[PDB]
Design a protein around this ligand. Structure first.
Ligand SMILES: C[S@@+](CC[C@H](N)C(=O)[O-])C[C@H]1O[C@@H](n2cnc3c(N)ncnc32)[C@H](O)[C@@H]1O
Ligand SMILES: [Zn+2]
Ligand SMILES: [Zn+2]
Ligand SMILES: [Zn+2]
Lengths: 12, 245
């Protein structure tokens, strides 16, 4: 769709 | 811009009236621990009474649980004095919610925060891939501007859109002062925000979203940093399927 996404934590 | 302390979010009636006047952010269900949409000790030597009176740290920098990013339990050899139960005891940094010029609401330090200080846990509803797609479809139909999805682990996305805490206000920066740290508490993985440097009082708290964009259009970045990447999500768009873990 128009906008959107997912935040990804730093590799831990 | 207007500001509000974390005590202001405990009264739902007063908050909902402040939201009508734009003095507080829009209403959401305040939670203190993740809610799933579909349902040994360390080897630290206990501190003596003299060591605690001096100010020494129980399960400090050397703790074996602290090293595997695992919090201690109530059975810790340091008992109540264990400093490695921050998520469980809600030992949060003093923060306030503020209205930014162009990013919506944000978070700011209410006191000077040393480097590697636990800010808040990123709480919300934990979704599997089908539930995540369901929320993606709903938010696309609603024409939402803000997104609150945080990848936790395979087939686990935290969605703080409807339920969460003030960590859902942390904005993105291309030169941030916080980072996530994924901690295990009672065998369950949790995401928390931690300062990465000394953050002076009144400064906005930010982290690098490392945003995985499924949207057709990318959101322009207003972080104002000299190294700004210009957008949240970079150049490449991924599918809804791939963004969710
Ligand atoms: C996790 S919410 C953060 C809280 C949000 N600012 C609010 O008012 O509820 C993420 C949304 O904030 C906005 N945002 C965060 N960081 C931004 C930035 N550096 N530049 C532009 N918008 C930003 C975007 O609309 C993004 O989808
Ligand atoms: Zn320990
Ligand atoms: Zn401990
Ligand atoms: Zn930027």
């Amino acid at each position: 769709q128009h906008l959107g996404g997912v935040m990804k934590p730093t590799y831990d | 811009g207007p500001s509000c302390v974390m005590d202001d979010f405990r009264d739902p009636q007063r908050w909902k009236e402040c939201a009508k006047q734009g003095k507080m952010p829009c209403y959401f269900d305040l939670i203190e621990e993740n809610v799933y949409l579909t349902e040994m000790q360390c080897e630290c030597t206990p501190l003596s009474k003299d060591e605690r009176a001096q100010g020494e740290i129980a399960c400090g920098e050397d703790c074996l649980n602290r090293l595997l990013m695992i919090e201690c339990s109530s059975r810790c050899p340091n008992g109540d004095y264990c400093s490695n139960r921050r998520f469980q005891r809600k030992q949060h940094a003093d923060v306030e919610v503020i209205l930014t010029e162009k990013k919506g609401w944000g978070l700011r330090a209410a006191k000077d925060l040393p480097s590697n200080t636990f800010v808040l846990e990123y709480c919300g509803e934990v979704l599997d891939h089908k539930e995540f797609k369901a929320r993606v479809k709903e938010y696309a139909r609603n024409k939402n501007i803000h997104y609150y999805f945080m990848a936790l682990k395979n087939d686990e996305i935290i969605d703080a859109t409807q339920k969460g805490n003030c960590s859902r206000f942390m904005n993105h920066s291309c030169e941030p002062n916080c980072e996530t740290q994924k901690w295990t508490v009672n065998g369950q993985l949790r995401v928390g925000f931690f300062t990465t440097k000394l953050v002076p009082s009144g400064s906005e708290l930010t982290f690098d979203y490392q945003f995985q964009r499924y949207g057709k259009e990318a959101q322009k970045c207003f972080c104002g940093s000299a190294n700004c990447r210009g957008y949240l999500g970079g150049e490449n768009r991924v599918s809804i399927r791939a963004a969710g873990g």
